[PDB]
What does this fold into?
Amino acid sequence: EHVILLNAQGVPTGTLEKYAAHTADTRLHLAFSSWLFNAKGQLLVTRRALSKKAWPGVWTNSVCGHPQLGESNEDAVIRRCRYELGVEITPPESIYPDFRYRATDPSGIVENEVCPVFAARTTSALQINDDEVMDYQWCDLADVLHGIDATPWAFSPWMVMQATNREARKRLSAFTQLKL
Amino acid sequence: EHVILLNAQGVPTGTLEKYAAHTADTRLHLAFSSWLFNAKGQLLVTRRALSKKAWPGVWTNSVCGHPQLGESNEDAVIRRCRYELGVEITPPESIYPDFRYRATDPSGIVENEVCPVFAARTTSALQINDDEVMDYQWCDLADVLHGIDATPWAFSPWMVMQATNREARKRLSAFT
Ligand SMILES: [Mg+2]
Ligand SMILES: [Mg+2]
Ligand SMILES: [Mn+2]
Ligand SMILES: [Mn+2]
It folds into this structure.
């Protein structure tokens, strides 16, 4: 598994093995983040497993990951939803295409990413992958946003950064409608 | 270190080594929980180390622990305050003396405790023991309650159950 390296502007220059790529000195690379809603409009929040190299044991949005060579961002969303959560989804919608961020985790690991954000609906039951996700909750988006506003430090920084972007937040809101 | 085994009434009936005591089948034993506030009235919230056997990596109140045989609850609080956080405190005050709870963490480790709750003020700076605490935050109690009320799953279930008890929330709200 690898990551797609990017330079100063957002242009690909090559690839790099994924573990080896996430260190105290992580270079810029391509990622995605997704927010998943069930038919009832509840948001899936997940807790990263304790074995993740970066932000292990941390509460965050539904799924994130790293597109591979030849993969579109949307296929990467679909693949990681299957891998981490075993779940089928509707075509992922682009809700924050220019999100980019750099952050250091509690033990020193850095994520440095160009990270377009998506939202989708789940169309199957979950089969959680315990190597990736250690806990989860189906919640009202309103509640999640109130908690992020009261105690943002309790959640991953990327989750918080995406949730307070005005435009992304309106799209999350639209996914809370009940759909049969 | 051990934990004190309790019968159906809270009577001590024996002890177990502390690590060996917390399993998927944890038996009832004695514990404490404490909420620490600084001189400014801010609440210390901590994140348990990833090495803790129960609820590793979970955001929770300031310091919790297990009194030893013959040790007062208050002395246990003062002991663990020193051990986990390097901090001196004022005499612990009771805020929820009959709290009792049983829960199972994401990996299946259970806590099963008679767990009186206290509150105190810090009188020195923190010196963090990273074998116990991996992160922490000084915050306004109001904000922490709002967070517990909105997303309780983001915090330890014991922190939530304490903060949601009417009286306890009452008494906590006065340390600010
Ligand atoms: Mg992932
Ligand atoms: Mg403790
Ligand atoms: Mn990455
Ligand atoms: Mn215990």
Residues B 3, 22, 29, 31, 66, 111, 113 surround manganese (II) ion (ligand 4) (CB under 6 Å). Chain B touches chain A at residues 47, 50, 56-59, 106-107, 134-135, 137, 139, 143-144, 146-147, 150-151, 153-155 (CB under 8 Å). The helical segments of chain B are 18-21, 73-85, 141-150, 157-164, 166-172.
